[PDB]
Amino acid sequence: SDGYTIKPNKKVTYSALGEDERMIGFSYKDFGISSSEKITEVQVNISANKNIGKYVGQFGTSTTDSANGYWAMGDEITQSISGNSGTITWKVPSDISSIIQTQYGGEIKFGVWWIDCDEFTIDSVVLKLEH
Ligand SMILES: [Ca+2]
Ligand SMILES: [Ca+2]
Ligand SMILES: [Ca+2]
């Protein structure tokens, strides 16, 4: 396989999230990914009832590296979406992709630091693979 998709249909209200709630988690087991597979990109497809505007945020993931606390984050992303639907893409660095933990409850986390349109739906999350 070269990719896996989930369709969570998850409604998010940004202004309702507390400080400790601004990362939204998805368990890797929900995708059906094998531990032989290397993730190269993550895409989050979102939609709203009005033009979305700017998103600012970051992705995090469970890892197998205990020295760094079993956790890694990518760089900050700013993306502007001109219409009622769009895609936020994280190109996963090689040094993170090699240690992602898909087993034992590992998660991918979608951090929302700001979004102009307050209410949106996560329609799908897509993992693209290397091999
Ligand atoms: Ca953990
Ligand atoms: Ca353990
Ligand atoms: Ca600010």
Q: What would you say this structure looks like, in words?
A:
It is classed as sugar binding protein. The entry lists the keywords sugar binding protein, glycoside hydrolase family 9, CEL9A, cellulosome, ruminococcus flavefaciens FD-1. There is one protein chain. With 131 residues, this protein is mainly beta. Helix content is 3%, strand content 51%. The strands form two sheets. Strands 1, 2, 4, 8 and 10 form a five-stranded antiparallel beta sheet that branches. Strands 3, 5, 6, 7 and 9 form a five-stranded antiparallel beta sheet that branches.
Count the E strands. Answer: 10
Could you give the distance between the termini? Answer: 9 Å
Largest sheet: 5 strands, antiparallel
Ligand list: calcium ion
Helix content bin: under 10%
Order of helices and strands: EEEEEEEEHEE
Query: What is the domain tally?
Result: 1
Number of continuous helical runs = 1
Strand proportion: over 45%
Outline, from the CA principal axes? Answer: globular
Rg result: 14 Å
Judged by helices, strands and strand pairing, the structural class is mainly beta
